[PDB]
Amino acid sequence: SAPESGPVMLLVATIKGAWFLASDPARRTWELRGPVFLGHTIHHIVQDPREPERMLMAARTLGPTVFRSDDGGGNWTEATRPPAFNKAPGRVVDHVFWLTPGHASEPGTWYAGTSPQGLFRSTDHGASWEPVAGFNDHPMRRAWTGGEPDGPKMHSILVDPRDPKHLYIGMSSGGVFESTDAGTDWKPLNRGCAANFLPDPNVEFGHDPHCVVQHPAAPDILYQQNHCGIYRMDRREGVWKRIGDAMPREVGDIGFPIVVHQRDPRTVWVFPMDGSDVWPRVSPGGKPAVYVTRDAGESWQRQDRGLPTDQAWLTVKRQAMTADAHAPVGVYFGTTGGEIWASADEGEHWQCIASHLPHIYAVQSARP
Numbered sequence: 149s150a151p152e153s154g155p156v157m158l159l160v161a162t163i164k165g166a167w168f169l170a171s172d173p174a175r176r177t178w179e180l181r182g183p184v185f186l187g188h189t190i191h192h193i194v195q196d197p198r199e200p201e202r203m204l205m206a207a208r209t210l211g212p213t214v215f216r217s218d219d220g221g222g223n224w225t226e227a228t229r230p231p232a233f234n235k236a237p238g239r240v241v242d243h244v245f246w247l248t249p250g251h252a253s254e255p256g257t258w259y260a261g262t263s264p265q266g267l268f269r270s271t272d273h274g275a276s277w278e279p280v281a282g283f284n285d286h287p288m289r290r291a292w293t294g295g296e297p298d299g300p301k302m303h304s305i306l307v308d309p310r311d312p313k314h315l316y317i318g319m320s321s322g323g324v325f326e327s328t329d330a331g332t333d334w335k336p337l338n339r340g341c342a343a344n345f346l347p348d349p350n351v352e353f354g355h356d357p358h359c360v361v362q363h364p365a366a367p368d369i370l371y372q373q374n375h376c377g378i379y380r381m382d383r384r385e386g387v388w389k390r391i392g393d394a395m396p397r398e399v400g401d402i403g404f405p406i407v408v409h410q411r412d413p414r415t416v417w418v419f420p421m422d423g424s425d426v427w428p429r430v431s432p433g434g435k436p437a438v439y440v441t442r443d444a445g446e447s448w449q450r451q452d453r454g455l456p457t458d459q460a461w462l463t464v465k466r467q468a469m470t471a472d473a474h475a476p477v478g479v480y481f482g483t484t485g486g487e488i489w490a491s492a493d494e495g496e497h498w499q500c501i502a503s504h505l506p507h508i509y510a511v512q513s514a515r516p
C-alpha cells in the first residue's frame with residue numbers, strides 16, 4: 149500500500165439527512181455540502197472502493213431502502229428491490245443498518261445488514277437485493293439472534309480481501325460469526341470474548357460486539373470494540389484476547405467504534421464511553437478522548453488535544469469513526485451532538501470541522 153494523496157471526503161449519515169465534507173489536498177480546510185435527503189434518517193453512506201464514482205446510502209422513507217449513485221453522489225436512485233425478508237409460511241426489515249462492498253474480483257456485489265438481524269446481497273451495484281438464505285434461514289438463526297433501543301441489528305459485514313467466500317458478520321446481540329463458503333453456512337466465533345450481561349458469560353454465542361474490523365494488510369488480524377471490551381484476534385489462534393485490559397481502570401475499554409490504520413495492523417483507535425451500568429446502557433463521560441494503540445493493544449495512549457477538556461458529554465456511535473489512507477493517516481469522528489472532529493496526524497490533534505448537524509449515525513472516508 150502506497151499512501152493515498154489529495155482531497156479527502158467524509159460521508160456523514162444523520163438522523164435527518166446526509167452531509168458531505170470535502171478537504172483541500174493538505175486536509176486543513178474543509179467544505180460542507182448538504183443536506184441531501186433532508187428529513188430522512190440515513191444510516192450508512194459507503195463509497196465503492198473498486199469504483200469510486202459509485203456510492204450506496206442506507207436510508208428510511210419509500211420505507212427502508214438503499215439509494216445508489218454512479219456519479220460520486222450527484223444523483224441518487226432508490227433500490228428497485230430493497231432488502232426485504234421472504235414471506236413467512238414473519239419478520240419485517242425495520243432498516244438497512246450496514247453496507248459492505250464486495251471483493252475486488254466481483255464488481256457490483258455488496259452485502260447489507262439489517263435491523264432486525266438479516267444479511268442480504270446485491271450483485272447489480274445495489275439496485276436489487278436478495279436474502280443470503282444461508283444466514284436468514286439457518287436452523288440456528290432464531291437462537292443466535294433471539295428477539296427485539298433502536299432494535300437489534302446486523303453489522304460489521306467483512307469480506308476477506310484474499311477470498312470472497314470468507315465472510316465475517318457481527319450481531320447486536322448474537323456475536324461474531326464466520327462463513328468460509330460465501331454465506332451458505334455460518335458458525336459462531338466468540339471464543340475469549342466476555343458476555344457479562346448474560347447469565348453464563350462462557351457460552352458460544354449471545355455476545356454484543358459493537359464494531360468488528362479485519363485488517364487489510366494482515367487479514368488474519370481482527371479487532372473489535374465489544375460491549376465487554378476491546379479485543380484482538382489472530383484468526384490462526386481462533387481466540388479473542390482482551391487488549392482492552394491494558395486500558396486505564398478509570399477509563400475502561402467499553403465504547404462503540406473501532407478503526408485500524410490501513411497499512412499498520414498494530415495501530416487501532418477507539419472512543420471510550422462508560423459501560424458501568426446494566427446492559428445495553430452506555431453513557432458518555434465528561435472528558436472526551438480517542439485512545440490509540442501502536443503496538444496491537446499492549447499499550448494505549450490518550451488523544452484529546454483540541455477536544456473540549458471537561459463538562460463535554462460526547463457519544464460516538466459504531467459507524468461514527470473513520471480513517472483515511474493518507475500519510476500520516478487522518479482520523480475522524482462524528483458525535484450525536486452533531487460535531488465532526490478531524491485529525492490529520494493519526495489522532496494527536498483534533499479540530500472541529502463541522503458543528504450543529506443533526507444526530508450523527510455514521511462517518512465514512514471516501515476518495516473524491
Ligand SMILES: [Cl-]
Nearest residue numbers: 232233240241
Ligand atoms: Cl421485510
Ligand SMILES: [Cl-]
Nearest residue numbers: 233234279284
Ligand atoms: Cl429472508
Ligand SMILES: [Cl-]
Nearest residue numbers: 342344376377
Ligand atoms: Cl465487561
Ligand SMILES: [Cl-]
Nearest residue numbers: 163505506507
Ligand atoms: Cl438532532
